[PDB]
Amino acid sequence: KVFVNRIINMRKIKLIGLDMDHTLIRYNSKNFESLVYDLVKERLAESFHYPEEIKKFKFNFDDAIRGLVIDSKNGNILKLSRYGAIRLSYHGTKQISFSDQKKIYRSIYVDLGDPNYMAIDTSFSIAFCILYGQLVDLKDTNPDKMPSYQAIAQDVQYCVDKVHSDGTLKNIIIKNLKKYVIREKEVVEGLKHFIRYGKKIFILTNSEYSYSKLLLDYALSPFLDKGEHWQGLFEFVITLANKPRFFYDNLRFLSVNPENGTMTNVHGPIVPGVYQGGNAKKFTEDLGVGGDEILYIGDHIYGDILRLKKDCNWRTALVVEELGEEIASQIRALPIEKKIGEAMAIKKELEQKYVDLCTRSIDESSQQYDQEIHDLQLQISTVDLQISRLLQEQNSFYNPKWERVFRAGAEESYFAYQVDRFACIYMEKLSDLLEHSPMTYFRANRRLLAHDID
Amino acid sequence: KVFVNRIINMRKIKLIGLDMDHTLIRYNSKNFESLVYDLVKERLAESFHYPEEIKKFKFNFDDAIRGLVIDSKNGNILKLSRYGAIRLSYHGTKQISFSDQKKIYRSIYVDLGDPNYMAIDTSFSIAFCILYGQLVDLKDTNPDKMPSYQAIAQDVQYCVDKVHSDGTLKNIIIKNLKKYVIREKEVVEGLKHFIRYGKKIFILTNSEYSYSKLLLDYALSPFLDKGEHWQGLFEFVITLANKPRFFYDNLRFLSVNPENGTMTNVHGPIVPGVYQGGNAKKFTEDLGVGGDEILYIGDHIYGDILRLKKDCNWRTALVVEELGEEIASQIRALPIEKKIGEAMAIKKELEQKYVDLCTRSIDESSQQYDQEIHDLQLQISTVDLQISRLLQEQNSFYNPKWERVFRAGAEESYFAYQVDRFACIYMEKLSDLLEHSPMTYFRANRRLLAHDID
Amino acid sequence: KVFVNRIINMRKIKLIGLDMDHTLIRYNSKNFESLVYDLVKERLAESFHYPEEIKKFKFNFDDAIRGLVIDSKNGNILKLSRYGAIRLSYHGTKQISFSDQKKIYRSIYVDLGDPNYMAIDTSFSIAFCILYGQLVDLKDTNPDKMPSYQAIAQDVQYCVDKVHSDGTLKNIIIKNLKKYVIREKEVVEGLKHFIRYGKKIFILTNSEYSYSKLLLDYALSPFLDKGEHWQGLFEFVITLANKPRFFYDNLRFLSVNPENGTMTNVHGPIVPGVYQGGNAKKFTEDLGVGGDEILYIGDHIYGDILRLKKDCNWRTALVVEELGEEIASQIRALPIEKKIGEAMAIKKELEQKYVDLCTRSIDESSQQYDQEIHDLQLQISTVDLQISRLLQEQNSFYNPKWERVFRAGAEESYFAYQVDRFACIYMEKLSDLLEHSPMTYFRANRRLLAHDID
Amino acid sequence: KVFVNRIINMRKIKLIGLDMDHTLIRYNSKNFESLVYDLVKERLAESFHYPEEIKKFKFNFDDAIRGLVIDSKNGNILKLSRYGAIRLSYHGTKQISFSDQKKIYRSIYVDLGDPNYMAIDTSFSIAFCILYGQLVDLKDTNPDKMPSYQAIAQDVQYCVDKVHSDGTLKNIIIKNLKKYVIREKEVVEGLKHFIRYGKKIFILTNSEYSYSKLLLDYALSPFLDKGEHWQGLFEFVITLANKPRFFYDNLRFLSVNPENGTMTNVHGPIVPGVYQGGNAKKFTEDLGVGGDEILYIGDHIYGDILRLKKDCNWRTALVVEELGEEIASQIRALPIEKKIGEAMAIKKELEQKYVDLCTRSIDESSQQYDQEIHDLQLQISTVDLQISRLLQEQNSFYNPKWERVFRAGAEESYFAYQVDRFACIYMEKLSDLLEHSPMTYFRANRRLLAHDID
């Protein structure tokens, strides 16, 4: 239910901070992504005068997965490993051959230090990868009509940001709430469960208060009892947090009058209430607590991991919605996984008898097992072909284009690495955590190195 | 015997490149380090006019371990984790308290991007950390007499480099070979074993040919049969390789006349023989092979890992001598490890009955188990104190000052991370690898994520 | 009166933005600096527990000049040239010898890219250089009691920033206005003169509105006629601008109700009124004008010049108060300047007759003018000694410790370079510019290269 | 004849180092550039399989000038000012409109820190800019056939480097010496003149010795007397210097046997003779002199200026061949320059009477000079049109496409800035300097700031 990377004693936590959207309030990711895609697509032709055709682009949710990286320079989308090696790549929607991948990058690795790459985990990655993919396909068709790959990417990023602060996005959903947000009673039960154990919960969102009030009201209030209000659930509600800068920057707080919505500058320490802007530094101080006593839970890293972890110090946990289907798919592939595990053991011992009757014809003899081993080279190619098919069968249980989110080839993917480094704890959704005792001591499993003995 | 991080099919390898010193030719690390320390210490007072006292400094091999990082700015030596968190630190030889560590670094993490840190794995790290430690202790005592911490560090690094190219080091050992180099017959048997399977071996060292000939002659020739010569063992012997630049730079090759030692510039493709300088790019080309068909084995990363792995492409393996005692010590601590593993299981179930009779007095009741649980808080503190002692007993099996080389706290150390990223394969010594069949297929174990099922 | 670096046609300017403090409102720099110094000194011992002695530190305004650079790493203060060469340096208050300067920096140049250097022009540079100087003198005396040079510098910078947002500074002056601010009637006459020609003036300060209203009221209102108000002078008054980020960042605007001081978020284009925060991008857009139609005048570069000039595009001018005494001092040294100019011409022709009767004894003859020229070597040393004294006399007309602000040795100083690159136009004070016709076309003089002919 | 940026006392100089090619030995730049262009063009289609058409590309020497910068990312060539502002730009060979330039760069400035720009002054800049220009014109025509702009640029740079070390270039010229090298007797007379005054001259080239001997023999020997040899002219001749790394790097020296050409490693201090490789650090030391006593003269900055000036310390001078025509053209435009200078003075006083009868109709009156001034607005437009034509006439005296090399618009160009910062002294050719007395004291003219008085 809850996965541990680093120890975190919930008994030592006095405040739990929650991202409002996608963390505290769940959204139908498929609909939400589709919506953002349509708006950004529309906005491209409306303010950037992109080719008419794009309005006709079909949105396929499975065209991308979470954790992908795009290099704005070459209009490519890559799935990297934990150390930045290219597992697979596409130029637009056209896959790049391993051969040509190496000719393109002069290496199997890439350097994310190079800003020409977009490697930040964001809540729109998927939509942005799908639109960008087909967006560079158009570009190729008639280079003279559309800007450059790096220009296109910057444009899409701009539209994606504008629409979020434009009001465009929030309005469409605030009027189709039942379609975009999925309510969950367990969430309010969990918050009450934790508050009941002395925990103080606060939320910080990049959304304005007016819109935040409407949303919390719709997704929390209904599950409350008579005489209860969602406002009593949170010690603080920081709006327009301006994450990630909120964590390591120094932007000032604005006290928000919950009624009229007007604000005043903050003088002195902050007190339970509604604010806008701010920074973790001042907030941790005013609360008179140590950063290791504060736990923040978000849905996306949304920033550079080293600066976030070094320049902040709050314990950080992650909610990874894609985990739902990832786990589900692995449980489904169990029987297939087993059939290849045994088809490997056979290829192993069968390949072992091959080197044996091999380290003879040229280690003790000089010719005698010539035909003896040849029967193994054919019997080994057979057990191999079986494995290729069994692998095809396994992939069918995952995204057909990009495979799993946490795996890149057989090792952990670049995204798996980000979760591991950024999060001490991660789960599918917020309630998975609230299900546990507010005084739980989370322990990580012993990693175990290659030269370690059981 | 041989530890795998990434798959490497020895059947696909046509050339194996070996570092001469510390990889192909083993040295008594204790004596070798002591020697380098004495020379560098002496050189400091001789050319830099450092205080007289240093000549009287006592060398303690256990004062440092491999994988440590020094920040020249503050005269500190730190043991980092895989993600750069400070596990323990010393200012000189004086340990820094966790408290003061955070006050000093404003975080538990550090950023190795910051050049004020020395984080390269080198063959003198240990000696350099010991001398530097006591060297900043002197500095403190009378700040006016010695340069700054960052000045001192640069000076030591200079002496360490000068002595290696000075002739100072090579001469002392070339005259006490039996004391500094440990000969191993298995090494020549292994090389012959691999050559016998079609493998071409070449060596590349940062040492001059004249000195190289003397060393190979002394450590390989004796184990050879009548009519055999060590020169027939190697396809190429690149001298003054100038590693790591040899891998990613473009420095030119100089053909070396094995007799008189004179050189001529290279025109055209290189051929079996003796060279000086060079670069992997030209060498891989002339040999008409793919970089993934070449495997280089070294004893130290000795450079920036990303540039080395990205800008080269040869398969790279590592020989980690410290692995000897590390493994040996873990096997010795096995019984202790078991006694704490059980003393944990008890603290676990005992701590579980604590939250149980806890999530009652404030979840179903309001007061009743007040004294009931208090007996557990005392019984839990006891089973805990036992664990502290059992841990003291365990540490006694490792370096008393810095603990294990591959572990930082309970997770992998910064050095473990370097091995993993830089090496596809690693072992205690070269012969461990030559012991295997030249046509072995090395496979890495499935890593397994926190949300994976067995 | 007004100095031109780059052409700027005031006829093309529709809006002039002014920094409120030090630009629109003049302050007694001596008193203001002294005040900031005392507060920061006091704050060091109050919150950082610095040694008691500092409270007893004497403030000498002439101990520093504008344009100096401090390297936090070594506790040094340097006067650099246009290309970053060290003209003179001090460790604390102790001058460093040219000899030792080179031994310290391994070069006569430094690299400001290196963040260990503080090279930003700020309104407290002088006070900060004086306090820091004596602050590292204390550090030396007893290294164990005070933090490191780089720690000290960061502490001072912190105190300097805290006191500015603390209220500490603004309060002391708001209560001694007649002592800190120097009122000038010409300023209001000039603003009216420009407004009269269609120019729109706006101010943007890093000060809160409440304090801004008090200040403008005190320094502008008195010079106004019956029925006139200072608020009618400005189209916009952006408060807590958060410069320099205001120029290139994206921070949001907050509409400020001039009455109660409360704010609301901005929706749509900004309109004449009072705001807080903001960014030049949105502001330039809403006003429907090109950035080259907007001119901003400040008193300090206060940021990185390339990012400010590249990422903004507004025309930028600078007010350099130190220019007053600099020019005044040069006019005073005129007669001395002339006496050395002639004492040079003599050393020139006299040195020319030296090479003449020199390129003979070894170009036509071989010995004959041996004693003939020796009379010149003594007569040349004399005319030289006279020049050394005449130079001593000249320096007496400038800061005794650091010489001129715009000159470093004989070439332009590092600060001269900053003005030139950042400002198209610069003057001693704001009114110098308002004195000109609002429709003036400012032209820069032809620079002229070494190989150009008159 | 010789232009001074910074003082340099030739009496204090004990060694003068000279680049062999383009500095000591003059080449017909037009032929040399054309040759390099043809070889690189040919090499592109030969090893990179570039489109057949390129072989048919016509080389126009005037298509580029020295000092241009290319941004590999967008396939553009720009002429920058001293502070990096774009004076004019071309995409391939197609000029970019000021309008579109700003839309492309989001600013009038660019940041050369960004490695996507090629801003190093090299001896092939011109040829490379011409070929690259037409090379991206082809790319546009059929994007699918040629690599990307940044790929193309890297390819051209590769061909340009390969051909120089290939032997291709050196061979063609060594066989048409009379066509590519221009011999000058004054050069040998000057060297003898300086040697005669105690100066030691050494040369360092990136060319092999064998080729160097042939060239010096052909360009110096003929002008020598009976019994004289060019080898007696130089104290040291460092071959394959590997500039610029030679200056700041640490590459080792190889002693070269002038006879057979074979080398041996250097042990101890270097002595008069022939070497290969090396570094300025060791060389300055062995000679037992201060870097400020050594003067190096080159033809191109060929590297990063700050690292070259900071990490070396030798006095550096520059030979700028383009200076010939630049000066010549300015002397020719003198009469035109004068006709516009007077046509400006008139537009000035005429524009002054305009603001006068302007600061009345709205400063004293309100309407009266309505038609009075209108006669000036037409009379001012006329004197302006005359100026536009007079400017057209002036440009005709310079490169029609890029204007002057040292001027960008009216201020100094980016290249002028490089010369100024890198060179203390610069001239058209080496003999211009040797013409002066070996004991000359070079002084730079007082720069003079905008607020300085004559």
Which has the closest alpha carbon to B233: B208, B206, B199, B269? B199
Which has the closest alpha carbon to C197: C10, C18, C20? C10
Burial category of C191 from C-beta neighbours within 10 Å (exposed 0-12, middle 13-18, buried 19 and up): buried
The alpha-carbon gap from B280 to the nearest alpha carbon of chain A, in Å, equals 14
CA distance A62 to A130: 9
Contact C135, C152 (CB under 8 A): yes
Would you call C264 and A265 a contact, using CB atoms and an 8 Å cutoff?
A: no
Which residue is it, tokens 């003059």? D26
Q: Has C275 been labeled as part of a binding site?
A: no
Spatial strand order in the sheet of B117-118 = B94-96, B86-91, B76-80, B69-71, B117-118
The alpha-carbon gap from A241 to the nearest alpha carbon of chain D, in Å, equals 29
In degrees and rounded to multiples of 5, residue A331 shows phi and psi of -70, -30
Q: Has B140 been labeled as part of a binding site?
A: no
Cβ contacts of residue D172 below 8 Å, gap of 6+? D35, D39
Would you call A73 and D150 a contact, using CB atoms and an 8 Å cutoff?
A: yes
CB atoms within 10 A of CB C42: 15
Would you call B421 and A83 a contact, using CB atoms and an 8 Å cutoff?
A: yes
Element (H, E) at C204: strand C200-204
CA distance D47 to A180: 57
In three-state secondary structure terms, A204 is strand
Hey, what CATH class is B322-398 in? mainly alpha
Please tell me the number of Cα atoms within 13 Å of C38 on its side-chain side.
9
CA distance B405 to B403: 7
DSSP state of A226: T
Q: Answer positive or negative: Cα dihedral of C105, C110, C116, C120.
A: positive
CA distance D27 to D183: 8
Would you call B83 and A406 a contact, using CB atoms and an 8 Å cutoff?
A: no
Contact C425, C298 (CB under 8 A): no
Contact D41, D131 (CB under 8 A): yes
- B73 touches C: beta carbon within 8 Å: yes
Q: Which residue of D has its CA nearest to B268?
A: D166
Which has the closest alpha carbon to B335: B390, B403, B282, B411? B390
Q: Answer positive or negative: Cα dihedral of C70, C75, C79, C84.
A: negative
Would you call C254 and A263 a contact, using CB atoms and an 8 Å cutoff?
A: yes
Q: Which residue of A has its CA nearest to D148?
A: A74
Give the tokens for residue D11: 């009496």
CA distance A113 to A123: 22
The alpha-carbon gap from B129 to the nearest alpha carbon of chain C, in Å, equals 22
Give the tokens for residue A442: 């989370």
Would you call A208 and C265 a contact, using CB atoms and an 8 Å cutoff?
A: yes
Cβ contacts of residue D133 below 8 Å, gap of 6+? D63, D64, D77, D90, D92, D93
In degrees and rounded to multiples of 5, residue D339 shows phi and psi of -65, -30
Strand-strand pairing, B294-298 and B15-18 = parallel
Would you call A252 and C261 a contact, using CB atoms and an 8 Å cutoff?
A: no
Would you call D451 and C326 a contact, using CB atoms and an 8 Å cutoff?
A: yes
Q: Which of D449, D452, D453, D454 to mutate to test the interface with C (most CBs of C within 10 A)?
A: D449
CA distance C158 to A235: 30
In three-state secondary structure terms, A332 is helix
Would you call D208 and B251 a contact, using CB atoms and an 8 Å cutoff?
A: no
- B154 touches C: beta carbon within 8 Å: no
The alpha-carbon gap from A181 to the nearest alpha carbon of chain C, in Å, equals 26
In three-state secondary structure terms, A121 is coil
CB atoms within 10 A of CB B420: 21
3-state secondary structure chain D: CEEECCCEECCCCCEEEECCECCCEEECHHHHHHHHHHHHHHHHHHHCCCCHHHHHCCCCHHHCCCCCEEECCCCEEEEEECCCEEEEEEECCEEECHHHHHHHHCCCECCCCCCCEECCCCCCHHHHHHHHHHHHHHHHHCCCCCCCHHHHHHHHHHHHHHHHHHCHHHHHHHCCHHHHEECCHHHHHHHHHHHCCCCEEEEECCCCHHHHHHHHHHHCHHHCCCCCCHHHHCCEEEECCCCCHHHHCCCCEEEECCCCCCEEECCCCCCCEEEEECCHHHHHHHCCCCHHHEEEEECCCCCCHHHHHHCCCCEEEEECCCHHHHHHHHHHCHHHHHHHHHHHHHHHHHHHHHHHCCCCCCCCCCCCCHHHHHHHHHHHHHHHHHHHHHHHHHHCCCCCCCCCCCEECCEEEHHHHHHHHHCCEEECCHHHHHCCCCCCEECCCCCCCCCCCC
- C249 touches A: beta carbon within 8 Å: no
DSSP state of C142: -
Give the tokens for residue C397: 């007309």
Q: Cα B127 to chain center, whole Å?
A: 13
The alpha-carbon gap from A325 to the nearest alpha carbon of chain D, in Å, equals 39
Cβ contacts of residue B437 below 8 Å, gap of 6+? A355, A359, B10, B197
- C150 touches B: beta carbon within 8 Å: yes
- E strand residue ranges, A56-126: 69-71, 76-80, 86-91, 94-96, 117-118
- E strand residue ranges, A184-310: 200-204, 236-239, 253-256, 263-265, 273-277, 294-298
CA distance A260 to A264: 12
B244 contacts on D by Cβ (under 8 Å): none
Would you call B143 and C143 a contact, using CB atoms and an 8 Å cutoff?
A: yes
Point out the residue among B251, B252, B264 whose CB comes nearest to the CB of D261. B264
CB atoms within 10 A of CB A165: 15
In the chain, the amino acid numbered B140 is: D
DSSP secondary structure letters along A238-251:
EES--TTHHHHS-P
Cis peptide leading into residue D269 (ω within 30°): no
Would you call A143 and D143 a contact, using CB atoms and an 8 Å cutoff?
A: yes
Residue A256, strand partner residues: A263, A274
C366 contacts on D by Cβ (under 8 Å): none
In degrees and rounded to multiples of 5, residue B366 shows phi and psi of -160, -5
A-contacting chains (≥3 CB pairs under 8 Å):
B, C, D
CA distance A411 to C26: 65
No. of helices (H) and no. of strands (E), chain B? 16, 21
C residues 196-215 near D, CB within 8 Å? Answer: 196-197
Cβ contacts of residue A438 below 8 Å, gap of 6+? A10, A193, A194, A196, A197, A198, A199
CA distance D107 to D104: 8
Burial category of C132 from C-beta neighbours within 10 Å (exposed 0-12, middle 13-18, buried 19 and up): buried
In three-state secondary structure terms, A321 is coil
In degrees and rounded to multiples of 5, residue D367 shows phi and psi of 170, 125
3-state secondary structure D288-322: CCCHHHEEEEECCCCCCHHHHHHCCCCEEEEECCC
Contact D280, D241 (CB under 8 A): no
Q: What is the CA radius of gyration of chain B?
A: 26
Would you call B111 and A306 a contact, using CB atoms and an 8 Å cutoff?
A: yes
Q: What angle do the packed helices C149-166 and C29-47 form, to 10 degrees?
A: 110
B330 contacts on A by Cβ (under 8 Å): 452-453
A residues 126-145 near D, CB within 8 Å? Answer: 140, 143
The alpha-carbon gap from A102 to the nearest alpha carbon of chain B, in Å, equals 11
Would you call B73 and C150 a contact, using CB atoms and an 8 Å cutoff?
A: yes
Which has the closest alpha carbon to A307: C201, B107, D68, D317? B107
- A416 touches B: beta carbon within 8 Å: yes
In three-state secondary structure terms, B24 is coil
- C336 touches A: beta carbon within 8 Å: no
Q: Has A66 been labeled as part of a binding site?
A: no
CB atoms within 10 A of CB D430: 25
Q: Cα C215 to chain center, whole Å?
A: 23
Contact B251, B279 (CB under 8 A): yes
Which has the closest alpha carbon to D416: D15, D1, D47, D3? D3
Q: Which residue of D has its CA nearest to C442?
A: D348
Q: How far is CA A344 from CA A340, A349, C131, in A?
A: 6, 9, 73
Would you call B254 and D263 a contact, using CB atoms and an 8 Å cutoff?
A: yes
DSSP state of B407: E
In the chain, the amino acid numbered D377 is: Q
Q: How far is CA A400 from CA A394, A395, D350, in A?
A: 10, 7, 77
Rounded to the nearest 5 degrees, what angle is found at the Cα of B289, between the Cα atoms of B283 and B290?
Answer: 100
A107 contacts on B by Cβ (under 8 Å): 310-311, 313
CA distance A313 to A331: 36
A150 contacts on D by Cβ (under 8 Å): 73
Cβ contacts of residue C424 below 8 Å, gap of 6+? C4, C5, C6, C7, C8, C315, C316, C317, C442
Contact D44, D54 (CB under 8 A): yes
> Residues D288-296: contacts with CB within 8 Å, 24+ apart?
D289/D14, D289/D15, D291/D315, D292/D12, D293/D12, D293/D13, D293/D14, D293/D15, D294/D13, D294/D14, D294/D15, D294/D16, D294/D17, D295/D8, D295/D10, D295/D13, D295/D15, D295/D16, D295/D17, D296/D16, D296/D17, D296/D18, D296/D19, D296/D204
Residue D109, strand partner residues: D85
D143 contacts on A by Cβ (under 8 Å): 140, 143
Contact A8, A315 (CB under 8 A): yes
CA distance D192 to D431: 12
Torsion of CA B267, B273, B278, B284, to 10 degrees: 90
Give the tokens for residue A176: 């189709």
CA distance A333 to A328: 9
Would you call A449 and B411 a contact, using CB atoms and an 8 Å cutoff?
A: no
B residues 259-318 near D, CB within 8 Å? Answer: 261-265, 267, 276
Contact C136, C149 (CB under 8 A): yes
Residue C263, strand partner residues: A263, C256
Domain at C1-27+181-321+414-443, CATH homologous superfamily: HAD superfamily/HAD-like (3.40.50.1000)
Point out the residue among A362, A446, A451 whose CB comes nearest to the CB of B327. A451
No. of helices (H) and no. of strands (E), chain C? 16, 21
Contact B141, B21 (CB under 8 A): no
Q: How far is CA D438 from CA B61, D6, D376, D425, in A?
A: 60, 17, 59, 14
Would you call A330 and B108 a contact, using CB atoms and an 8 Å cutoff?
A: no
Residue A89, strand partner residues: A78, A96
User: CB pairs below 8 Å between A and C: how many?
Assistant: 26
Which has the closest alpha carbon to D42: D19, D24, D59, D17? D59
Q: Has D82 been labeled as part of a binding site?
A: yes
CA distance A222 to A229: 10
D265 contacts on B by Cβ (under 8 Å): 208, 240, 276
Q: Has B299 been labeled as part of a binding site?
A: yes
Which residue is it, tokens 């610029």? D244
- For chain C, the structural domain boundaries read 1-27+181-321+414-443, 28-180+399-413, 322-398
DSSP state of A7: -
The alpha-carbon gap from A147 to the nearest alpha carbon of chain D, in Å, equals 10
- C11 touches D: beta carbon within 8 Å: no
Residue C89, strand partner residues: C78, C96
Contact D355, C437 (CB under 8 A): yes
Contact A208, A240 (CB under 8 A): yes
C-contacting chains (≥3 CB pairs under 8 Å):
A, B, D
D-contacting chains (≥3 CB pairs under 8 Å):
A, B, C
Please tell me the number of Cα atoms within 13 Å of B330 on its side-chain side.
15
D residues 376-415 near C, CB within 8 Å? Answer: 406, 410-412
Would you call C254 and A252 a contact, using CB atoms and an 8 Å cutoff?
A: no
In the chain, the amino acid numbered C381 is: S
